[PDB]
Amino acid sequence: STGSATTTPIDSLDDAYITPVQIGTPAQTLNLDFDTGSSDLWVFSSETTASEVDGQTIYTPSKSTTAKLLSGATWSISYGDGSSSSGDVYTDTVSVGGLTVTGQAVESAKKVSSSFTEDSTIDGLLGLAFSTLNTVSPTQQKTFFDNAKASLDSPVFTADLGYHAPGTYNFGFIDTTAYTGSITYTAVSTKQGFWEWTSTGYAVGSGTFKSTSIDGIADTGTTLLYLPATVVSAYWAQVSGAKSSSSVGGYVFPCSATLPSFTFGVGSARIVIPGDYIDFGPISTGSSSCFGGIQSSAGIGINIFGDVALKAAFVVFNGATTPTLGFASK
């Protein structure tokens, strides 16, 4: 089997991407944030504290003839940005782009933190990291991908995120028309539960490539590109007037700037992030200080190849016995 679904930016900045997901019988369609940096499929629901729901579409398990309470199971998750959610668990039928999994753990939110409530466009998350990170207790549950794998034509999914435009998540096949040149594959460590890999270096603008190993995670559920302070300083030093602002929480730059590109290495291959992808607009409405799309990972504890990086590429998440990651230009 295969599946193919369009993923759409939530706003004019590409802060996140949502993908329609069918849950239950009859189908209830929710728009979920596909997140290769976590491993829980959770939704706003009829159980979510009413004051914490503001415009989201909710899953109502009592209206699904295939929903079953997973007795005794609870979940609770905290994300890299400090947001959180928690609740109980149902199993139900879940379909993405025509690919159906029966018995999928659907984690129903009883509580969500403020940045979920305030994001009316995100109805929940669909985790695509390794199932070892799943938070369900006392019996850990499998991701949608893990459940689908055996049925897939090939045990892969691909992320093709757009720049200020829709893109595609495919399951079970590699669309050879969706990228240019060849796909370069690189080793993955699953030891921390993430799609963790090592970039071979970087360049700023038309500058020379610096060969240096940068361990990080491929994370569709994080907006920005978080890299070591040395790398980030080298990037922003090429933008007149750019500076790190403790008050704002990272590098800002004059909105009148033209940003240089940023290249990262995948083996001997190179992925180029155009300068415009690194512009996240005014820090507040009407400000001439703009927020940068490349930020320091210092104090995160890991480097993160978030959407800024991934949307410059066609990315293969290869879930074979020994997982790997592939990147192609597009």
Q: Which residues are catalytic?
A: 35, 199
Tell me the sheet residues that pair with 107: 42, 89
Long-range CB pairs of 79-86, under 8 A, 24+ apart, other chains included: 79/38, 79/221, 80/37, 80/222, 80/300, 80/304, 81/115, 81/222, 82/113, 83/113, 83/114, 83/115, 83/116, 84/112, 84/113, 85/42, 85/109, 85/111, 85/112, 85/113, 85/116, 86/110, 86/111
Residue 275, by phi and psi: left (phi above 0), alpha (psi -120 to 50) or beta?
A: alpha
By residue count, the chain amounts to 330
Helix or strand (DSSP H, E) at 114:
helix 114-117
The bridge status of strand 279-282 relative to strand 289-292 is antiparallel
The answer to whether residues 91 and 67 touch, using CB atoms and an 8 Å cutoff, is yes
**Helix then strand then coil, % of the chain, to nearest 5:** 10, 45, 45
Distance between CA 109 and CA 284 in Å, rounded? 31
Tokens coding 61: 């398990």
Distance between CA 163 and CA 293 in Å, rounded? 13
Distance between CA 190 and CA 199 in Å, rounded? 16
Tokens coding 166: 């829709």
Residues contacting residue 236 through CB under 8 Å, at least 6 positions apart: 242, 243, 244, 251, 253, 292, 294
